[PDB]
Structure 1
Amino acid sequence: MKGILGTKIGMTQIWKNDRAIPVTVVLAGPCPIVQRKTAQTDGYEAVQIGYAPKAERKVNKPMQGHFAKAGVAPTRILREFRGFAPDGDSVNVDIFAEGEKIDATGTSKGKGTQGVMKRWNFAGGPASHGSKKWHRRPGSIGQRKTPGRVYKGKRMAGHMGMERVTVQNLEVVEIRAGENLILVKGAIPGANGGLVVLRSAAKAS
């Protein structure tokens, strides 16, 4: 529910007490609140937030109108957050607490066309005792005369990566408001300089 938008900065090594901690640095920059979705107006409850600034010249006439209505500044990234109704213009301070478990989401790094061995952890085959199918190649796609078809969903080579990925229950190690930073234990999906969506634990333990 209570969420924000940021940018993956990098990973570093940090200590808390006597133990080292791998940390992903997120610049969870200030988010203008740009549209309040109400059951009365939209049919569901949500908030449209904004992220990186955009030069006024780069902004088209229709997007200018959408921003001018809320009287903000044009952004570039616009996302909603269901059931989260704050007051003012969204920043991590007081939103997230040091220690709080969070749900980091982004777009995985894309690996293009990837065959069954990498894409699905296949096995491929013998590298030596007679082959033409040396390592990658799937085996049998099916059976015989029976479902003279191949099962829908059959794990096959395709475009791997560049998908939405949510990583549940990540520790909030440190927070540097004003610097608009948030240290998170572990690995968030996507590449550095990528959009990230940090929110309240989907369903906490």
Structure 2
Amino acid sequence: MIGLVGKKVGMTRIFTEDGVSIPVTVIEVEANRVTQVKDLANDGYRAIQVTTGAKKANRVTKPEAGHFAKAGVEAGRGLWEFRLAEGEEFTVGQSISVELFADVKKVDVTGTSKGKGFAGTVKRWNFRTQDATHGNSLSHRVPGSIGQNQTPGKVFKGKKMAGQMGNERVTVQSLDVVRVDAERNLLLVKGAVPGATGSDLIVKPAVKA
């Protein structure tokens, strides 16, 4: 099937009759007003666009209004495609919701990331640290040898070393659903998904069983 665009604000418990304490992440799905559903009519697609929040309207650009109005416009943070197979949906504000899930138990969630910045090995690549003593010189926690010699005469592509860390897609997969309680539009999953509170994040039913 397809998924909905939620928001992060989770990380909590939920004790069980038996005694278990289930971790959690509270995704909030404020309805998904389809913005411009379209089939093969235009492009090999077969997906359905959406929206969820609410721009101040005073901020929305004029262009960011036409496409809107050319359907059941309802502002919202952004727009999100949602590929589907063998299914219908009205190009007009249909606003799908968490009801989507219930019998659903998969879920995946795909927030942005965490964004460290610097990175550098030891963290950016779990690189091991060469003894902070027994000699050593300005080379305790450093790359140390990023190649070989004349034969290769260069440094191979993909060589793990420093460079911006985090701040990108990173999905998760699996994660059993705990609550699909609407009325508040809450979706409780197993635990920890990228995000960073308030950060937007998809929540499609796990490709894997």
TM-score normalized by structure 2? 0.92
Structure with greater strand share of residues: 1
- Matched with 2:146 is 141
Partners of 1:112 and 1:71 in 2: CA distance: 40
Partners of 1:194 and 1:55 in 2: CA distance: 18
Partners of 2:10 and 2:3 in 1: CA distance: 20
Partners of 1:26 and 1:192 in 2: CA distance: 9
> Is the contact made by 1:104 and 1:197 (CA closer than 8 Å) also made in structure 2?
yes
Deviations 1:124-171 (A, max 9, x none): 211111111453201211011011110000001000000111101111
> Is the contact made by 2:116 and 2:164 (CA closer than 8 Å) also made in structure 1?
yes
Structure 1 residue corresponding to 2:164, chosen from 151, 159, 163: 159
Shift of 1:50: 0.5
> Is the contact made by 2:33 and 2:72 (CA closer than 8 Å) also made in structure 1?
no
Runs of 4+ in 1 over 2 A off after TM superposition: 84-88
Runs of 5+ unmatched residues, structure 1: none
Partners of 2:172 and 2:20 in 1: CA distance: 23
Most deviating of 80-89 and 148-157: 80-89
- Matched with 2:97 is 91
> Is the contact made by 2:65 and 2:73 (CA closer than 8 Å) also made in structure 1?
no
Partners of 2:125 and 2:102 in 1: CA distance: 38
Partners of 1:180 and 1:80 in 2: CA distance: 20
> Is the contact made by 1:115 and 1:136 (CA closer than 8 Å) also made in structure 2?
no
- Matched with 2:76 is 75
The equivalences for 1:1-205 within 5 A come to 1-17=1-17, 18-83=19-84, 85-87=88-90, 88-93=94-99, 95-97=100-102, 100-204=105-209
Partners of 2:103 and 2:190 in 1: CA distance: 11
Shift of 1:99: 6.3
TM-score normalized by structure 1? 0.93
Any idea what SS the aligned residue of 1:188 has? coil
Partners of 1:36 and 1:66 in 2: CA distance: 11
- Percentage identity across paired residues of the two chains: 50
> Is the contact made by 2:104 and 2:205 (CA closer than 8 Å) also made in structure 1?
no
Shift of 1:26: 0.9
Aligned CA RMSD, in angstroms, stands at 1.5
- Paired amino acid for 1:90: I
